Design a binder for this molecule. Sequence first.
Ligand SMILES: CC(=O)N[C@@H]1[C@@H](O)[C@H](O[C@@H]2O[C@H](CO)[C@@H](O[C@@H]3O[C@H](CO)[C@@H](O)[C@H](O)[C@H]3NC(C)=O)[C@H](O)[C@H]2NC(C)=O)[C@@H](CO)O[C@@H]1O
Ligand code: CA
Ligand code: CA
Ligand code: CL
Ligand code: CL
Ligand code: CL
Ligand code: MG
Ligand code: MG
Ligand code: MG
Length: 537
Amino acid sequence: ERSELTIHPKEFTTFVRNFNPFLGATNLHTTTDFIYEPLVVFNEMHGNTPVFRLAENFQMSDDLMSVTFDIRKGVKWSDGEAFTADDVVYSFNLVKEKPELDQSGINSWVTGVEKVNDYQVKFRLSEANSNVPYEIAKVPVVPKHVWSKVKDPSTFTNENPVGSGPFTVIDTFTPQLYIQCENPNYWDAANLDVDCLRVPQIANNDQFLGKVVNGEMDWTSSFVPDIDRTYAAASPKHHYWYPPAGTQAFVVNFKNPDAAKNEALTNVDFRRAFSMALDRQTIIDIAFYGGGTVNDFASGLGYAFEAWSDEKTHDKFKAYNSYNAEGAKKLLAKAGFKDVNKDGFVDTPSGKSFELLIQSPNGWTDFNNTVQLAVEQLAEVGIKARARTPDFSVYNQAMLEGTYDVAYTNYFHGADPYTYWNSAYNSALQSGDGMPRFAMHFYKNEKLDGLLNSFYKTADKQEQLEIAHGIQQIIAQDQVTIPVLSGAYMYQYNTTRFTGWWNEENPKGRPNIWAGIPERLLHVLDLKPVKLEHHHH
Ligand SMILES: CC(=O)N[C@@H]1[C@@H](O)[C@H](O[C@@H]2O[C@H](CO)[C@@H](O[C@@H]3O[C@H](CO)[C@@H](O)[C@H](O)[C@H]3NC(C)=O)[C@H](O)[C@H]2NC(C)=O)[C@@H](CO)O[C@@H]1O
Ligand SMILES: [Ca+2]
Ligand SMILES: [Ca+2]
Ligand SMILES: [Cl-]
Ligand SMILES: [Cl-]
Ligand SMILES: [Cl-]
Ligand SMILES: [Mg+2]
Ligand SMILES: [Mg+2]
Ligand SMILES: [Mg+2]
């Protein structure tokens, strides 16, 4: 009687009812896009082509110091009230007044928002930035007529959401399953053929594997080991498409509170020897079953941005980011990391023993295995390390608070190098209660920040390329992180119950179901239920 699409955007041990789009640490990951539709979805796989949703147009000013957005008329909230400029203006003012709700750093860019009329908003910028409509689209727009009356938006759980997107009705909710049904007032209802999102609680990759192999899922983006043998071979309806994704690296804490570990981690010779100890292709072969590409760029750029790469820089530092056990041992010796207590593990120049604790998230088994391989490879050059696999929130918090030693992490990936470099190295993103982990190495370089903040400042493509080369040089020469590989956008789909999926023959955009992939809105608008085959009673 209704089509239910079973999706898996995020692992949870238990579902807590939270649909606050600003509360990324604690909300459910079907809130953004599916409850709160964006102004615009930029199709990152297709050159950031803008797909207009609740806005029908935007227009930048002469000098890139402002931009105006035109709001689509006739759009209703799920309670029947009108979607207008009022809501956009309020949402941005809310994030400005309460910066712990800024999860992107939008406050650094937008100094003010002004209602031009009921269907146009103007944004004033702190600085010139041709990329700011992209930034603006990241901010959730919530209904002012509801949220302005809310006690405290920063602690509002929003259990009965009023939304603009396709699925706003909470049909069923249990700690282990919830079902999110069609917005009865959805502006783009004629384009939508899925009735409900069905979201089961899955805690880790182990629990996932059993369910996906058994055909219990429709749309997922989890790591699956030996995928051809385990999942694809199980049914002719089991499909996948793994387009290339972003950089993954070992990130070291430059502000480690332990004296010995700080001494090691802040030493560029040590970071380079660490990096040379790793066998990146073996990590890809074993931990990812071949699903990745070696990243031997000291700057972490990766091979998917060859038009952008300064090949002289890449070549200069590539040796430090290539498997070379003997080279690593020789460098540790030259630097003065000498074993002075006969245990085969190097000690710091001041003579102190230490063991690096390397963390990755609990249940992210491909990363867990990567870390364990690295532990073994590090031991072969005399670097003592051991693995920890803390709960994601604990993992995350340790990075935010700077209490970790080394962490393995992936990064956002975009149509140009700025998505990675800015999110991973801009020191402004090292502070703020809404900030993610990505820049939390606490390396700070003012010249680097300056180049990043200038990337979209001139409409001059050659200058922008020179800025990129400058960024690449700084990060490479300082071996700020230890890049390992370029990963994949894991994505599995089931044709048993639905058709219309994006895939290698229909590569319309990033196909993943994770929150933070706004294209998943466009994707679900393409899916159509299948007439089930008849069976007993
Ligand atoms: C609050 C919010 O919207 N946060 C978004 C954040 O969750 C997104 O980060 C992605 O989250 C998914 C889910 O945890 C990550 O997918 C996992 O990758 C592991 C490593 O390969 C696999 O072992 C897991 O199987 C897989 N889990 C699932 C359920 O698919 C994904 O790696 C992660 N990406 C990054 C980068 O952190 C981001 C990006 O979409 O957006 C929001 O920040
Ligand atoms: Ca209103
Ligand atoms: Ca020793
Ligand atoms: Cl509801
Ligand atoms: Cl496919
Ligand atoms: Cl490089
Ligand atoms: Mg269950
Ligand atoms: Mg419809
Ligand atoms: Mg459609």
